[PDB]
């Protein structure tokens, strides 16, 4: 067909892109499109095709295989595991795998609970029983966790809402590059601040690993690792919490069910990921050779987006897919990807989301959405499903 312009679809396409994705899926697996930002890319839609492409080594994540150029500021930060293939990817992920196991992340539970308690206390102080859930919770909890973990001092953390705000929804191209340069310069000064201080946080550890053996972790990869750990876990966990609570509060049958039986909570969190998880499309992939998908040939070097949102509405794989149902069999969702890059952070994402959902339900009586769904505004980006705000209210 021709290329399909997505920016030239309404705020409607941002508010509910799923029917567009479903229509493409009925035509085939791979489609050339143009993003609202302006970029010519491929979409891959359909569960079985998504799953497969995420795990197919012909699809590289190394920008050396892309025909798309990076700016200087972007180049300085691509020395990370998510934008690598084996063997670099293998080497890099070994350095932090131990820190993100289920058993190790469980040790954080008391602290995370303590962070959520304080954030909810503060919220419930509001005199008119209303708040924005983003400002009060979905946003502060994950920065706070990832910031203690890596050793970002308190005063420096606000900057991150601004820097990542510009990576998602900039005012223009040039401010994304400025944020990037600004963030890179800050992570170097932070990294240097750790050297020689004998600190026991994750970033001090990495500084020591790099200093001990530059071939295991170069100083560009050291920066890249700090960068990826911050970003990758933060834009995503924020919007999971926010979207997830939005799904629950816009499906009051399901909210009631979970109140009545809080053993259902983990299952609910998984269905929050399946139904409206923050990663709408996976991160860029570039074919190392022409790749044929039901007779559509995607050329070597092109940018390919696996549309996870659409794999999640594929009825052959998720029955009655438009239904939000916290008891559903969710095993096999691709919210955390699939394959060698499967999310390193998932045990932490889950731990925070489970604790936040439960605190809200247990401490807010008659908790409720404080606008209509049609009033909410979603960020247009086809890679990130997220709200501008989430007005709620409760009794008192
Ligand atoms: C709701 C929470 C989260 C979601 C939905 C999410 C999603 C994902 C997805 C889909 C990928 C794979 C992307 C691809 O293959 O293109 C990924 C990779 C990754 N995530 Fe997450 N993530 C979340 C939380 C976190 C957290 C909390 C961290 C870090 C603390 C984190 C760190 C990473 C890293 C480092 C990778 C790259 C791993 C690799 O290349 O081997 N994520 N995540
Ligand atoms: C689940 C993984 C997260 O994705 C990322 O961290 C990717 C790799 C990051 O990508 C880039 O850094 C990027 C993306 C496109 C072009 C150039 C670059 C520069 N890079 C080579 C250092 C960009 C897309 C960050 C934004 C959109 C975000 O908050 C994403 C949050 C999640 C979706």
Tab-separated table of C-alpha atoms and ligand atoms in Angstrom:
chain	number	residue	atom	x	y	z
A	1	UNK	CA	0.000	0.000	0.000
A	2	UNK	CA	1.098	3.611	0.489
A	3	UNK	CA	2.746	4.728	3.723
A	4	UNK	CA	0.141	5.511	6.437
A	5	UNK	CA	0.463	8.830	8.284
A	6	UNK	CA	-0.372	8.457	11.964
A	7	UNK	CA	0.135	12.111	12.970
A	8	UNK	CA	-2.538	12.873	10.352
A	9	UNK	CA	-5.016	10.789	12.414
A	10	UNK	CA	-6.779	12.477	15.330
A	11	UNK	CA	-5.955	12.750	18.978
A	12	UNK	CA	-8.402	9.830	18.508
A	13	UNK	CA	-5.584	7.628	17.290
A	14	UNK	CA	-3.620	8.525	20.418
A	15	UNK	CA	-6.618	8.065	22.684
A	16	UNK	CA	-7.458	4.653	21.089
A	17	UNK	CA	-4.980	3.362	18.472
A	18	UNK	CA	-6.085	-0.228	18.772
A	19	UNK	CA	-8.613	-0.332	15.817
A	20	UNK	CA	-5.967	1.039	13.472
A	21	UNK	CA	-3.553	-1.606	14.599
A	22	UNK	CA	-6.268	-4.264	14.259
A	23	UNK	CA	-7.102	-3.148	10.748
A	24	UNK	CA	-3.410	-3.380	9.687
A	25	UNK	CA	-3.254	-6.820	11.261
A	26	UNK	CA	-6.094	-8.037	9.031
A	27	UNK	CA	-4.029	-6.946	5.981
A	28	UNK	CA	-0.787	-8.587	7.116
A	29	UNK	CA	2.155	-8.553	9.583
A	30	UNK	CA	4.416	-5.642	8.410
A	31	UNK	CA	3.431	-2.120	7.426
A	32	UNK	CA	5.383	1.097	6.520
A	33	UNK	CA	4.081	4.068	8.449
A	34	UNK	CA	5.034	7.568	9.444
A	35	UNK	CA	5.093	8.659	13.077
A	36	UNK	CA	3.490	11.831	14.451
A	37	UNK	CA	7.099	12.830	15.242
A	38	UNK	CA	7.894	12.411	11.441
A	39	UNK	CA	9.903	9.113	11.080
A	40	UNK	CA	9.357	6.476	8.361
A	41	UNK	CA	9.250	3.086	10.148
A	42	UNK	CA	7.764	-0.454	9.911
A	43	UNK	CA	5.123	-1.794	12.220
A	44	UNK	CA	4.848	-5.448	13.013
A	45	UNK	CA	1.408	-6.439	14.304
A	46	UNK	CA	-0.102	-9.737	15.495
A	47	UNK	CA	0.850	-11.847	18.495
A	48	UNK	CA	2.649	-14.751	16.810
A	49	UNK	CA	4.529	-12.435	14.521
A	50	UNK	CA	5.414	-10.040	17.328
A	51	UNK	CA	6.663	-12.767	19.614
A	52	UNK	CA	8.784	-14.224	16.875
A	53	UNK	CA	10.381	-10.949	15.732
A	54	UNK	CA	11.277	-10.035	19.340
A	55	UNK	CA	13.288	-13.311	19.546
A	56	UNK	CA	14.669	-13.406	15.972
A	57	UNK	CA	18.451	-12.637	15.767
A	58	UNK	CA	18.130	-11.341	12.200
A	59	UNK	CA	16.630	-8.278	13.946
A	60	UNK	CA	19.547	-6.405	15.487
A	61	UNK	CA	19.394	-3.724	18.142
A	62	UNK	CA	22.845	-2.426	17.290
A	63	UNK	CA	22.653	0.955	15.575
A	64	UNK	CA	25.609	-0.072	13.401
A	65	UNK	CA	22.979	-2.080	11.478
A	66	UNK	CA	20.662	0.931	10.995
A	67	UNK	CA	20.687	3.332	8.054
A	68	UNK	CA	19.274	5.973	10.359
A	69	UNK	CA	21.899	8.381	11.636
A	70	UNK	CA	22.375	9.369	15.254
A	71	UNK	CA	23.183	12.869	16.506
A	72	UNK	CA	26.301	13.450	18.612
A	73	UNK	CA	24.290	13.548	21.816
A	74	UNK	CA	22.469	10.250	21.012
A	75	UNK	CA	25.745	8.541	20.031
A	76	UNK	CA	27.331	9.388	23.334
A	77	UNK	CA	24.618	7.254	25.097
A	78	UNK	CA	24.026	4.138	22.906
A	79	UNK	CA	26.703	2.107	24.683
A	80	UNK	CA	23.997	0.179	26.568
A	81	UNK	CA	22.705	-3.346	26.614
A	82	UNK	CA	19.328	-2.690	25.117
A	83	UNK	CA	20.972	-1.211	22.095
A	84	UNK	CA	23.408	-4.125	21.591
A	85	UNK	CA	23.647	-7.665	20.211
A	86	UNK	CA	25.709	-10.566	21.483
A	87	UNK	CA	28.479	-10.670	22.499
A	88	UNK	CA	28.386	-7.080	23.820
A	89	UNK	CA	24.855	-7.567	25.152
A	90	UNK	CA	25.829	-10.731	26.937
A	91	UNK	CA	28.841	-9.150	28.599
A	92	UNK	CA	26.953	-6.043	29.680
A	93	UNK	CA	23.989	-7.862	31.149
A	94	UNK	CA	26.171	-10.181	33.220
A	95	UNK	CA	27.410	-7.148	35.171
A	96	UNK	CA	23.995	-6.382	36.663
A	97	UNK	CA	21.951	-9.609	36.444
A	98	UNK	CA	22.657	-10.608	40.022
A	99	UNK	CA	21.312	-7.190	41.306
A	100	UNK	CA	17.849	-7.698	39.688
A	101	UNK	CA	16.862	-11.245	40.608
A	102	UNK	CA	13.561	-11.868	42.327
A	103	UNK	CA	15.273	-12.852	45.596
A	104	UNK	CA	17.440	-9.742	45.595
A	105	UNK	CA	14.660	-7.328	44.677
A	106	UNK	CA	12.587	-8.811	47.462
A	107	UNK	CA	15.114	-7.298	49.923
A	108	UNK	CA	13.857	-3.882	48.789
A	109	UNK	CA	10.241	-4.564	49.890
A	110	UNK	CA	10.417	-2.833	53.305
A	111	UNK	CA	11.946	0.240	51.850
A	112	UNK	CA	9.521	0.417	48.888
A	113	UNK	CA	6.566	-0.038	51.252
A	114	UNK	CA	7.969	2.794	53.369
A	115	UNK	CA	8.205	5.064	50.269
A	116	UNK	CA	4.604	4.345	49.192
A	117	UNK	CA	3.233	4.781	52.721
A	118	UNK	CA	4.764	8.255	52.899
A	119	UNK	CA	3.536	9.196	49.463
A	120	UNK	CA	-0.029	8.069	50.237
A	121	UNK	CA	-0.051	9.786	53.687
A	122	UNK	CA	0.829	12.974	51.918
A	123	UNK	CA	-1.875	12.450	49.313
A	124	UNK	CA	-4.617	11.801	51.833
A	125	UNK	CA	-3.814	15.097	53.543
A	126	UNK	CA	-5.423	16.993	50.689
A	127	UNK	CA	-8.463	18.782	52.234
A	128	UNK	CA	-11.027	18.162	49.431
A	129	UNK	CA	-10.280	14.412	48.964
A	130	UNK	CA	-8.932	14.902	45.425
A	131	UNK	CA	-5.495	14.449	43.819
A	132	UNK	CA	-3.597	13.822	40.690
A	133	UNK	CA	-2.337	10.291	40.936
A	134	UNK	CA	0.631	11.004	38.674
A	135	UNK	CA	2.041	13.809	40.784
A	136	UNK	CA	1.228	12.136	44.067
A	137	UNK	CA	2.354	8.576	43.412
A	138	UNK	CA	2.911	7.132	39.963
A	139	UNK	CA	5.657	9.615	39.326
A	140	UNK	CA	7.521	9.961	42.621
A	141	UNK	CA	7.676	6.298	43.659
A	142	UNK	CA	9.791	4.935	40.798
A	143	UNK	CA	12.260	7.810	40.581
A	144	UNK	CA	12.691	7.500	44.283
A	145	UNK	CA	13.444	3.786	44.143
A	146	UNK	CA	15.717	3.893	41.225
A	147	UNK	CA	17.429	6.952	42.666
A	148	UNK	CA	18.250	5.341	46.011
A	149	UNK	CA	19.419	2.241	44.242
A	150	UNK	CA	21.856	4.009	42.003
A	151	UNK	CA	22.792	6.827	44.440
A	152	UNK	CA	21.286	9.975	42.936
A	153	UNK	CA	21.183	12.633	45.678
A	154	UNK	CA	17.764	13.985	46.627
A	155	UNK	CA	18.239	17.507	45.197
A	156	UNK	CA	19.125	16.261	41.717
A	157	UNK	CA	16.037	14.096	41.103
A	158	UNK	CA	13.555	16.758	39.928
A	159	UNK	CA	15.635	17.362	36.778
A	160	UNK	CA	14.707	13.867	35.607
A	161	UNK	CA	10.954	14.608	35.149
A	162	UNK	CA	12.040	17.416	32.854
A	163	UNK	CA	14.653	15.443	30.912
A	164	UNK	CA	12.401	12.401	30.341
A	165	UNK	CA	9.335	14.644	29.697
A	166	UNK	CA	11.337	15.894	26.696
A	167	UNK	CA	12.280	12.346	25.465
A	168	UNK	CA	8.571	11.389	25.411
A	169	UNK	CA	6.694	14.625	24.601
A	170	UNK	CA	9.098	17.433	23.593
A	171	UNK	CA	8.092	20.974	22.591
A	172	UNK	CA	10.501	20.459	19.626
A	173	UNK	CA	13.439	18.269	18.383
A	174	UNK	CA	16.152	20.610	19.682
A	175	UNK	CA	15.009	20.361	23.328
A	176	UNK	CA	15.254	16.526	23.299
A	177	UNK	CA	18.938	16.941	22.246
A	178	UNK	CA	19.539	19.555	24.924
A	179	UNK	CA	17.988	17.355	27.594
A	180	UNK	CA	20.161	14.498	26.383
A	181	UNK	CA	23.387	16.540	26.511
A	182	UNK	CA	22.351	17.872	29.880
A	183	UNK	CA	21.611	14.439	31.252
A	184	UNK	CA	24.814	12.940	29.914
A	185	UNK	CA	26.898	15.743	31.516
A	186	UNK	CA	25.129	15.222	34.829
A	187	UNK	CA	25.690	11.393	34.820
A	188	UNK	CA	29.422	11.964	34.218
A	189	UNK	CA	29.675	14.358	37.136
A	190	UNK	CA	27.703	11.889	39.278
A	191	UNK	CA	29.885	8.966	38.204
A	192	UNK	CA	33.048	10.957	38.994
A	193	UNK	CA	31.581	11.889	42.365
A	194	UNK	CA	31.468	8.211	43.279
A	195	UNK	CA	35.042	7.315	42.378
A	196	UNK	CA	37.139	6.621	45.372
A	197	UNK	CA	34.327	7.029	47.912
A	198	UNK	CA	33.858	3.376	48.819
A	199	UNK	CA	30.074	3.674	48.398
A	200	UNK	CA	27.941	0.512	48.328
A	201	UNK	CA	25.183	1.685	45.948
A	202	UNK	CA	24.862	0.240	42.453
A	203	UNK	CA	26.558	3.085	40.638
A	204	UNK	CA	29.634	3.027	42.955
A	205	UNK	CA	29.840	-0.734	42.217
A	206	UNK	CA	29.806	-0.159	38.534
A	207	UNK	CA	32.455	2.527	38.785
A	208	UNK	CA	34.695	0.058	40.546
A	209	UNK	CA	33.966	-2.650	37.888
A	210	UNK	CA	34.947	-0.293	35.098
A	211	UNK	CA	38.034	1.024	36.867
A	212	UNK	CA	39.222	-2.515	37.683
A	213	UNK	CA	39.007	-3.610	33.998
A	214	UNK	CA	38.157	-1.225	31.180
A	215	UNK	CA	37.608	-4.191	28.851
A	216	UNK	CA	34.692	-5.479	30.994
A	217	UNK	CA	33.023	-2.053	31.178
A	218	UNK	CA	34.365	0.944	29.349
A	219	UNK	CA	33.708	4.439	30.584
A	220	UNK	CA	31.313	5.049	27.713
A	221	UNK	CA	29.488	1.843	28.629
A	222	UNK	CA	29.608	2.998	32.273
A	223	UNK	CA	27.674	6.076	31.429
A	224	UNK	CA	25.373	4.121	29.120
A	225	UNK	CA	24.556	1.717	31.860
A	226	UNK	CA	23.654	4.412	34.334
A	227	UNK	CA	21.542	6.059	31.675
A	228	UNK	CA	19.630	2.925	30.676
A	229	UNK	CA	18.990	1.860	34.228
A	230	UNK	CA	17.433	5.239	34.993
A	231	UNK	CA	15.383	5.809	31.925
A	232	UNK	CA	14.259	2.284	31.075
A	233	UNK	CA	12.662	1.627	34.394
A	234	UNK	CA	11.049	4.866	35.076
A	235	UNK	CA	9.012	6.060	32.149
A	236	UNK	CA	7.623	2.503	32.144
A	237	UNK	CA	6.812	1.859	35.801
A	238	UNK	CA	5.232	5.290	36.050
A	239	UNK	CA	2.789	4.686	33.275
A	240	UNK	CA	2.091	1.108	34.379
A	241	UNK	CA	0.926	2.340	37.757
A	242	UNK	CA	-1.123	5.148	36.194
A	243	UNK	CA	-2.636	3.139	33.272
A	244	UNK	CA	-3.262	0.158	35.506
A	245	UNK	CA	-5.134	2.106	38.111
A	246	UNK	CA	-6.975	3.772	35.254
A	247	UNK	CA	-8.046	0.348	33.999
A	248	UNK	CA	-9.204	-0.727	37.346
A	249	UNK	CA	-11.115	2.496	38.092
A	250	UNK	CA	-12.761	2.569	34.710
A	251	UNK	CA	-13.812	-1.137	35.248
A	252	UNK	CA	-15.605	-0.990	38.545
A	253	UNK	CA	-16.771	-4.638	38.439
A	254	UNK	CA	-13.047	-5.590	38.499
A	255	UNK	CA	-12.152	-3.100	41.156
A	256	UNK	CA	-14.891	-4.567	43.356
A	257	UNK	CA	-13.639	-8.054	42.738
A	258	UNK	CA	-10.100	-7.177	43.845
A	259	UNK	CA	-11.319	-5.405	47.009
A	260	UNK	CA	-13.352	-8.472	47.966
A	261	UNK	CA	-10.339	-10.765	47.276
A	262	UNK	CA	-6.896	-9.222	47.581
A	263	UNK	CA	-5.214	-12.548	46.652
A	264	UNK	CA	-6.171	-11.485	43.102
A	265	UNK	CA	-3.719	-8.559	43.160
A	266	UNK	CA	-0.697	-10.126	41.354
A	267	UNK	CA	-3.056	-11.442	38.628
A	268	UNK	CA	-4.529	-7.894	38.336
A	269	UNK	CA	-1.114	-6.371	37.890
A	270	UNK	CA	-0.318	-8.849	35.097
A	271	UNK	CA	-3.623	-7.982	33.380
A	272	UNK	CA	-2.828	-4.308	33.789
A	273	UNK	CA	0.271	-5.112	31.707
A	274	UNK	CA	-1.578	-7.150	29.149
A	275	UNK	CA	-4.487	-4.646	28.767
A	276	UNK	CA	-2.766	-1.311	28.989
A	277	UNK	CA	0.923	-1.678	29.589
A	278	UNK	CA	3.203	1.303	29.045
A	279	UNK	CA	5.155	-0.210	26.162
A	280	UNK	CA	2.888	0.100	23.176
A	281	UNK	CA	5.706	-0.620	20.691
A	282	UNK	CA	9.055	-2.203	21.448
A	283	UNK	CA	12.344	-0.426	20.925
A	284	UNK	CA	13.926	-0.133	17.563
A	285	UNK	CA	15.084	-3.172	15.667
A	286	UNK	CA	17.052	-3.287	12.413
A	287	UNK	CA	17.241	-6.176	10.020
A	288	UNK	CA	20.808	-7.368	9.223
A	289	UNK	CA	19.497	-8.840	5.931
A	290	UNK	CA	16.254	-8.437	3.864
A	291	UNK	CA	13.540	-10.208	5.806
A	292	UNK	CA	10.420	-11.611	4.311
A	293	UNK	CA	7.175	-11.498	6.301
A	294	UNK	CA	4.197	-13.046	4.448
A	295	UNK	CA	5.683	-11.711	1.266
A	296	UNK	CA	6.418	-8.217	2.545
A	297	UNK	CA	10.179	-7.718	2.346
A	298	UNK	CA	11.629	-5.392	4.941
A	299	UNK	CA	14.983	-4.105	3.799
A	300	UNK	CA	18.229	-4.402	5.708
A	301	UNK	CA	18.809	-1.414	7.955
A	302	UNK	CA	15.221	-0.155	8.281
A	303	UNK	CA	13.628	0.652	11.598
A	304	UNK	CA	11.134	-1.974	12.870
A	305	UNK	CA	8.666	-1.500	15.752
A	306	UNK	CA	6.991	-4.541	17.249
A	307	UNK	CA	3.554	-3.336	18.284
A	308	UNK	CA	3.103	-5.067	21.589
A	309	UNK	CA	-0.258	-3.372	22.153
A	310	UNK	CA	-1.644	-5.102	19.151
A	311	UNK	CA	-0.193	-8.503	20.070
A	312	UNK	CA	-2.121	-8.089	23.273
A	313	UNK	CA	-5.442	-7.598	21.494
A	314	UNK	CA	-4.988	-10.606	19.155
A	315	UNK	CA	-8.102	-12.745	19.905
A	316	UNK	CA	-6.606	-16.005	18.761
A	317	UNK	CA	-4.157	-15.611	21.670
A	318	UNK	CA	-6.036	-13.513	24.230
A	319	UNK	CA	-9.747	-14.459	24.070
A	320	UNK	CA	-12.234	-11.597	24.324
A	321	UNK	CA	-9.208	-9.222	24.201
A	322	UNK	CA	-11.001	-5.852	24.761
A	323	UNK	CA	-12.162	-7.185	28.058
A	324	UNK	CA	-10.221	-6.147	31.143
A	325	UNK	CA	-10.332	-9.142	33.413
A	326	UNK	CA	-7.931	-9.615	36.295
A	327	UNK	CA	-8.467	-13.380	36.455
A	328	UNK	CA	-7.478	-13.953	32.846
A	329	UNK	CA	-4.632	-16.272	31.842
A	330	UNK	CA	-1.950	-13.614	31.148
A	331	UNK	CA	1.054	-15.949	30.685
A	332	UNK	CA	2.818	-14.958	27.441
A	333	UNK	CA	2.113	-11.282	27.320
A	334	UNK	CA	4.971	-9.321	25.760
A	335	UNK	CA	4.743	-6.279	28.057
A	336	UNK	CA	8.299	-7.069	29.227
A	337	UNK	CA	9.361	-8.122	25.747
A	338	UNK	CA	10.546	-11.622	24.994
A	339	UNK	CA	13.942	-13.095	24.210
A	340	UNK	CA	17.479	-12.062	25.114
A	341	UNK	CA	16.424	-8.509	26.023
A	342	UNK	CA	13.474	-9.513	28.198
A	343	UNK	CA	13.124	-6.843	30.922
A	344	UNK	CA	15.850	-7.031	33.582
A	345	UNK	CA	13.679	-4.842	35.768
A	346	UNK	CA	10.466	-6.807	35.768
A	347	UNK	CA	10.772	-8.125	39.357
A	348	UNK	CA	11.222	-4.580	40.537
A	349	UNK	CA	8.451	-3.181	38.304
A	350	UNK	CA	6.102	-5.771	39.766
A	351	UNK	CA	7.181	-5.222	43.294
A	352	UNK	CA	6.472	-1.450	43.083
A	353	UNK	CA	3.244	-1.832	41.130
A	354	UNK	CA	1.829	-4.480	43.472
A	355	UNK	CA	2.651	-2.391	46.537
A	356	UNK	CA	1.206	0.825	45.047
A	357	UNK	CA	-2.017	-0.769	43.811
A	358	UNK	CA	-2.595	-2.399	47.175
A	359	UNK	CA	-1.895	0.713	49.239
A	360	UNK	CA	-4.371	2.764	47.127
A	361	UNK	CA	-7.119	0.199	47.466
A	362	UNK	CA	-6.570	-0.375	51.163
A	363	UNK	CA	-6.243	3.221	52.206
A	364	UNK	CA	-8.649	5.050	49.885
A	365	UNK	CA	-12.327	4.269	50.604
A	366	UNK	CA	-14.643	4.817	47.609
A	367	UNK	CA	-11.538	5.615	45.565
A	368	UNK	CA	-12.633	6.888	42.155
A	369	UNK	CA	-11.761	8.426	38.841
A	370	UNK	CA	-12.424	12.174	39.106
A	371	UNK	CA	-13.016	12.977	35.439
A	372	UNK	CA	-14.630	11.053	32.611
A	373	UNK	CA	-12.456	8.789	30.491
A	374	UNK	CA	-13.088	10.960	27.458
A	375	UNK	CA	-11.572	13.916	29.361
A	376	UNK	CA	-8.199	12.142	29.931
A	377	UNK	CA	-5.412	12.982	27.529
A	378	UNK	CA	-2.873	10.423	26.280
A	379	UNK	CA	0.591	11.111	24.985
A	380	UNK	CA	0.485	10.532	21.146
A	381	UNK	CA	3.778	8.596	20.884
A	382	UNK	CA	3.206	5.115	19.419
A	383	UNK	CA	5.986	3.726	21.586
A	384	UNK	CA	4.598	4.851	24.963
A	385	UNK	CA	1.098	4.503	26.277
A	386	UNK	CA	0.729	7.185	28.956
A	387	UNK	CA	-1.531	9.828	30.406
A	388	UNK	CA	-0.790	13.564	30.877
A	389	UNK	CA	-2.569	13.321	34.284
A	390	UNK	CA	-4.927	11.062	36.315
A	391	UNK	CA	-7.441	12.897	38.518
A	392	UNK	CA	-8.814	10.758	41.338
A	393	UNK	CA	-10.854	11.317	44.506
A	394	UNK	CA	-11.832	9.321	47.666
A	395	UNK	CA	-14.110	9.673	50.709
A	396	UNK	CA	-13.067	12.660	53.032
B	1	LIG	C1	6.378	-1.431	34.075
B	1	LIG	C2	7.666	-1.593	34.119
B	1	LIG	C3	8.455	-2.025	32.945
B	1	LIG	C4	8.120	-2.407	31.693
B	1	LIG	C5	6.712	-2.534	31.101
B	1	LIG	C6	9.350	-2.633	31.016
B	1	LIG	C7	9.456	-3.075	29.718
B	1	LIG	C8	10.602	-3.485	29.107
B	1	LIG	C9	10.631	-3.993	27.803
B	1	LIG	C10	9.429	-4.237	26.929
B	1	LIG	C11	11.927	-4.235	27.490
B	1	LIG	C12	12.399	-4.883	26.219
B	1	LIG	C13	12.404	-3.894	25.066
B	1	LIG	C14	12.756	-4.479	23.739
B	1	LIG	O1	13.049	-5.691	23.600
B	1	LIG	O2	12.758	-3.691	22.780
B	1	LIG	C15	12.707	-3.889	28.621
B	1	LIG	C16	14.058	-4.009	28.678
B	1	LIG	C17	14.720	-3.473	29.746
B	1	LIG	N1	14.183	-2.943	30.876
B	1	LIG	FE1	12.343	-2.738	31.348
B	1	LIG	N2	10.350	-2.475	31.836
B	1	LIG	C18	9.922	-2.050	32.989
B	1	LIG	C19	10.643	-1.779	34.117
B	1	LIG	C20	12.011	-1.713	34.185
B	1	LIG	C21	12.731	-1.335	35.330
B	1	LIG	C22	12.096	-0.937	36.685
B	1	LIG	C23	14.040	-1.342	34.908
B	1	LIG	C24	15.281	-1.081	35.622
B	1	LIG	C25	15.342	-0.958	36.917
B	1	LIG	C26	14.078	-1.712	33.566
B	1	LIG	C27	15.233	-1.910	32.827
B	1	LIG	C28	15.243	-2.516	31.568
B	1	LIG	C29	16.486	-2.819	30.878
B	1	LIG	C30	17.863	-2.485	31.395
B	1	LIG	C31	16.190	-3.424	29.737
B	1	LIG	C32	17.146	-3.945	28.642
B	1	LIG	C33	17.555	-5.387	28.903
B	1	LIG	C34	18.382	-6.015	27.803
B	1	LIG	O3	18.678	-5.422	26.741
B	1	LIG	O4	18.835	-7.180	27.987
B	1	LIG	N3	12.817	-1.944	33.190
B	1	LIG	N4	11.869	-3.442	29.590
B	2	LIG	C1	11.384	-0.343	27.664
B	2	LIG	C2	12.662	0.387	27.329
B	2	LIG	C3	12.590	1.921	27.353
B	2	LIG	O1	13.170	2.411	26.132
B	2	LIG	C4	14.446	3.132	26.125
B	2	LIG	O2	15.097	3.374	27.122
B	2	LIG	C5	14.942	3.542	24.779
B	2	LIG	C6	16.112	2.613	24.413
B	2	LIG	C7	15.307	5.032	24.635
B	2	LIG	O3	16.045	4.918	23.439
B	2	LIG	C8	17.151	5.769	23.092
B	2	LIG	O4	17.997	6.008	23.945
B	2	LIG	C9	17.164	6.232	21.641
B	2	LIG	C10	16.009	6.034	20.859
B	2	LIG	C11	15.952	6.432	19.536
B	2	LIG	C12	17.061	7.035	18.954
B	2	LIG	C13	18.241	7.244	19.674
B	2	LIG	C14	18.355	6.860	21.000
B	2	LIG	C15	19.635	7.137	21.753
B	2	LIG	N1	20.278	5.907	22.188
B	2	LIG	C16	20.993	5.323	21.071
B	2	LIG	C17	21.145	6.130	23.347
B	2	LIG	C18	14.188	6.071	24.351
B	2	LIG	C19	13.214	5.572	23.273
B	2	LIG	C20	13.574	6.569	25.667
B	2	LIG	C21	12.121	7.117	25.813
B	2	LIG	C22	11.094	7.044	24.667
B	2	LIG	C23	11.602	6.355	27.006
B	2	LIG	O5	11.433	6.924	28.092
B	2	LIG	C24	11.455	4.888	26.794
B	2	LIG	C25	11.258	4.002	27.776
B	2	LIG	C26	11.174	2.502	27.480
B	2	LIG	C27	10.304	2.152	26.257
